[PDB]
Ligand binder design. Structure first.
Ligand SMILES: [Mg+2]
Ligand SMILES: [Mg+2]
Ligand SMILES: [Mg+2]
Ligand SMILES: [Mg+2]
Ligand SMILES: [Mg+2]
Ligand SMILES: [Mg+2]
Ligand SMILES: [Mg+2]
Ligand SMILES: [Mg+2]
Ligand SMILES: [Mg+2]
Ligand SMILES: [Mg+2]
Ligand SMILES: [Mg+2]
Lengths: 97, 55, 133, 250, 109, 288
């Protein structure tokens, strides 16, 4: 439980730096902009996760069905295995049945 | 391609005549349509045998 | 071998019909009120009661019925701009002869909404046609 | 010449409009250059911090993808075997040394993979949120309408000191109609500033509205906004996407 | 290019108010005063602007933007300007409030 | 307006710094830590449940499962192929003309009912159109041209009495789709196909002047229609003499999906231009 003896340099953060000032800027783009582009397109991320949501099982099964054949051998394997495990666990376990 | 014509299609530089079935496509659509969908008169006559048999 | 086609613009006013409205028609002014389906417009002036009821985006009176747990019956008055407390006074005082006792009330001041135990939907509809909201 | 702006849209019968000073940006000392009627249904709406909150969060989250993966006892390097036998050793029994119990072994639950929180606050809600935000920036007196936005010069000190003369508070969000039409002195002076910001009204947003101690709206901008928002109390439920052809609609 | 030194906004109404304002009624509306000078409506945009502008410079004081939906009669503007406002803080006021000797406030900012 | 407004002059800025969501919005999650919710964490003691494996849902502990003792039956039998018709009450109709959503002036078929959002059709779900009921029978004052897929006697009556003309027209799954959300079909940019003929079993329903079936012989239209009045006891109006006559007369081909268009055509909505085939085989195809 021995704890840090010397004060760290206080991290100074300008909340006024570019990215933070400009946060959430185009959020209303569809509405204010006579909808053409959806808020979705403001999402920069992993191919299969854009404008979508799900629990682990759905995520995984999705990554598979989308990028599956572009994955490395080993990751792929671990993915199929995680899938199986999850199948078994969500369907076949719980308190609530 | 079809969809792209629908969007703009003037500017899309899509060949218009291509938006209709080919001679093959045409004769096949023809073949199936006359196959599974009989004539109105012909359907009435299909019904007369039934109604009279049940009578 | 692409079949030949013909480009003419005069049949386009047929296609014009098929486009749906993205905004609701203001309802046709008639000679006779109420209408066959029972629709009454709000007045030319508005009353001086220190509260008001916006009609629905359908120009219907914003009184609805709602249940909870299948057995709890409720009636919701919506879109009310003014002192709702007054509206509460007047509503419960309208209903009290009907039930012999004041009906239970929940006022939501921030929501601009009123809530009342039981189904008064029909009678509140009328009573807001009275005051012409 | 007094600039006096009438609302381009019908007010409901029981409700009078609002009025804001039109300030201009060329002189420090030209404070009220004119008068504008604002629509009650946008800038007078019943203030609801509830929805402010809701949508403010929805702004924060819905973009969020957290990439944090931890490795389950399946994904760790090795230890595909029972370290020693079930019985007789006289110590606690284990499967793989990658049992989460073990030191260098797996993580039981933890984070999983790229993980997204994405959800769509319903339409008319986000809409009514901008509504409220504006109403609030106005009612707390910190909204300033401008005409023009033509700036005397590209010196940013001028701008800072202008905010100083008008007691504008620390931060400011400047809103203009389009990206192309912003005059060159605005762009110049502001792009070299931290606190002030310059944005097309297509990117007006709640979070930013609250993030800046003062909102400043151009007249064409307001005439635009008022309309775009007011559209929604009067609108049908979409049949198909609105981006498509509609009778009345663009 | 210069920057004007700020006003303190601290306000007390002068005793000549009524006369200033009525002078501004007659000059802004250009009207010979209908018998009630303070009950005439401000609804017209031009007249309202001219009125509150001249009133802005003369009294060295302006109306907050919210309050501008709230001015209709001239009586409203009257009662508005009748009210003083202190820009001093609760603290600055605490200093000037005649403090008992056993209380010493230091300001560490 | 909302005096709440004037309370905000008093208060400090609304900013991110101060925000509370509506009380009772977030009902807080709890976590199995601590003395109360730790230690068996509401999972019980031992047995099956504590280990998370309790058997599947239909299960009775091996006694022959409730849902499985009961014999099968034709119930949901052929449920997929049983036609559905979305109901439309007359009361709703009167409503929709009253608020001027659908206007009686120009002809009324399904499409218009749709665009007023007065009805909703999900063709993929085996919905074969709108059908008519008599609910506002006495309420109904409007003079209207209506084309539906099904209607009931009393309904036909209540439109007749006011002097409108009702026609029973059929649509197949595909054509019905094209009907309901037409603009997105155009943006599909495919030609506008032939209409199907109703199936064999349905044939008798559409060949009767009894229903004023669109495929029925017009020679019985004036007959059976007048008959409707003697049964329900009112004076039958003369439609031929009316001003709005030429709209009420307006029909479709049994091969036509819309009003004013024809099978084989193609709509370019960018150029606002219609395209028709000049090729013969095509015209023989789509005009047959
Ligand atoms: Mg999960
Ligand atoms: Mg409910
Ligand atoms: Mg292993
Ligand atoms: Mg092994
Ligand atoms: Mg093992
Ligand atoms: Mg290690
Ligand atoms: Mg590790
Ligand atoms: Mg316990
Ligand atoms: Mg135990
Ligand atoms: Mg046990
Ligand atoms: Mg349905």
């Amino acid at each position: 439980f021995h704890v840090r003896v010397t004060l760290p340099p206080r991290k100074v953060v300008d909340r006024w730096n570019e990215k933070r000032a400009m946060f959430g800027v185009y959020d209303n783009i569809g509405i204010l902009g006579n909808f053409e582009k959806h808020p979705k397109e403001l999402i920069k991320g992993p191919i299969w996760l854009r404008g979508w949501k799900g629990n682990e099982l759905q995520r995984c099964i999705r990554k598979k069905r989308m990028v599956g054949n572009r994955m490395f051998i080993d990751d792929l394997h671990n993915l199929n295995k995680r899938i199986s495990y999850l199948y078994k666990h969500f369907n076949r376990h719980g308190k609530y049945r | 391609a079809a969809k792209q014509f629908a969007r703009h299609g003037a500017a899309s530089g899509v060949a218009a005549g291509s938006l209709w079935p080919s001679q093959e496509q045409l004769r096949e659509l023809e073949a199936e349509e006359r196959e599974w969908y009989p004539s109105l008169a012909a359907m009435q006559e299909s019904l007369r045998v039934q109604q009279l048999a049940e009578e | 071998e692409y079949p030949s086609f013909v480009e003419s613009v005069d049949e386009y006013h047929f296609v014009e019909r098929l486009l749906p409205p993205a905004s609701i028609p203001r309802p046709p002014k008639h000679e006779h009120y109420p209408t066959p389906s029972g629709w009454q417009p709000p007045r030319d002036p508005a009353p001086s009661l220190p509260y008001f009821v916006r009609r629905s985006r359908m120009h219907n009176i914003p009184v609805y019925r709602d249940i909870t747990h299948g057995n709890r019956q409720m009636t919701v008055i919506r879109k009310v701009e003014g002192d709702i407390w007054a509206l509460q006074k007047d509503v419960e005082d309208f209903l009290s002869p009907l039930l012999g006792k004041t009906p239970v009330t929940q006022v939501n001041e921030v929501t601009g909404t009123l809530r009342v135990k039981g189904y008064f939907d029909q009678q509140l509809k009328a009573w807001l046609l009275e005051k012409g909201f | 010449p007094p600039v006096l702006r009438k609302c381009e849209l019908p007010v409901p019968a029981h409700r009078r409009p609002v009025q804001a000073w039109i300030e201009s940006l060329r002189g420090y000392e030209q404070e009220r250059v004119g008068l504008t009627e604002l629509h009650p249904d946008v800038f007078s709406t019943a203030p609801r911090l509830d929805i402010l909150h809701q949508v403010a969060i929805w702004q924060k989250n819905f973009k969020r993808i957290s990439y944090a993966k931890t490795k389950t006892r399946a994904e760790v390097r090795g230890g595909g075997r029972k370290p020693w036998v079930q019985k007789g050793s006289g110590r606690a029994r284990h499967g793989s040394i990658r049992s989460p119990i073990w030191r260098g072994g797996g993580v039981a639950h933890g984070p999983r993979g790229p993980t997204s929180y994405y959800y769509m606050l319903p339409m008319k809600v986000r809409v009514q949120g901008l509504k409220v935000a504006l109403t609030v920036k106005l009612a707390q007196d910190d909204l300033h309408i401008v005409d023009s936005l033509e700036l005397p010069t590209a010196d940013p000190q001028y701008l800072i000191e202008l905010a100083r003369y008008r007691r504008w508070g620390d931060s400011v969000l400047l809103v203009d109609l389009e990206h192309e039409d912003m005059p060159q002195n605005v762009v110049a002076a502001t792009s070299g500033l931290k606190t002030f910001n310059l944005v097309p009204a297509v990117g007006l947003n709640v979070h930013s509205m609250l993030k800046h101690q003062t909102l400043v709206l151009t007249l064409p901008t307001v005439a635009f906004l008022e309309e775009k928002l007011l559209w929604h109390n009067s609108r049908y439920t979409p049949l198909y996407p609105f981006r498509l052809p509609y009778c009345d609609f663009p | 290019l210069v920057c004007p030194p700020i006003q303190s906004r601290t306000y007390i109404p002068p005793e000549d108010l009524q006369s200033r304002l009525e002078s501004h009624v007659k000059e802004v509306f250009g009207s010979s005063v209908p018998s009630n000078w303070q009950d005439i409506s401000l609804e017209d945009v031009h007249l309202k602007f001219s009125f509150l502008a001249r009133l802005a410079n003369d009294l060295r004081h302006a109306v907050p933007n919210s309050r501008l939906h709230q001015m209709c009669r001239v009586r409203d503007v009257l009662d508005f300007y009748n009210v003083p406002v202190q820009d001093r803080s609760k603290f600055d006021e605490l200093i000037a409030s005649n403090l008992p000797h056993n209380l010493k406030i230091t300001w560490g900012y | 307006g909302p005096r709440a407004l004037d309370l905000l002059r008093a208060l400090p800025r609304v900013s991110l710094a101060n925000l509370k969501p509506n009380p009772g919005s977030r009902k807080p999650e709890r976590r199995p830590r601590g003395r109360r919710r730790g230690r068996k964490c509401g999972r019980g003691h031992k047995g099956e449940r504590q280990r998370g494996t309790r058997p599947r849902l239909g299960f009775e502990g091996g006694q022959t499962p409730f849902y499985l003792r009961i014999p099968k039956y034709g119930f949901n039998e052929g449920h997929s192929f049983r036609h559905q018709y979305q109901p439309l009450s007359l009361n709703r109709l009167q409503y929709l003309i009253d608020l001027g959503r659908v206007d009686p002036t120009q002809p009324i078929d399904l499409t218009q009912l749709v665009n007023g959002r007065g009805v909703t059709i999900q063709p993929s779900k085996r919905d074969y159109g709108v059908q008519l009921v008599e609910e506002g029978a006495d309420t109904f004052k409007a003079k209207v041209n209506i084309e539906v897929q099904m209607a009931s006697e009393l309904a036909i009556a209540a439109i007749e009495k006011n002097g409108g003309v009702v026609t029973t027209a059929f649509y197949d799954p595909r054509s019905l789709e094209i009907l309901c959300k037409p603009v997105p079909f155009f943006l599909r940019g495919q030609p506008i196909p032939k209409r199907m003929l109703p199936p064999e079993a349905l044939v008798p329903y559409y060949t009767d002047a009894k229903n004023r079936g669109y495929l029925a012989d017009p020679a019985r239209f004036p007959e059976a229609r007048l008959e409707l009045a003697r049964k329900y006891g009112y004076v039958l109006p003369d439609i031929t003499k009316d001003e709005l006559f030429k709209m009420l007369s307006t029909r479709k081909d049994p091969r036509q999906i819309f009003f004013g268009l024809a099978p084989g055509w193609v709509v370019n909505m960018a150029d606002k231009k219609i395209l028709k085939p000049t090729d013969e085989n095509l015209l023989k195809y789509y005009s047959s």
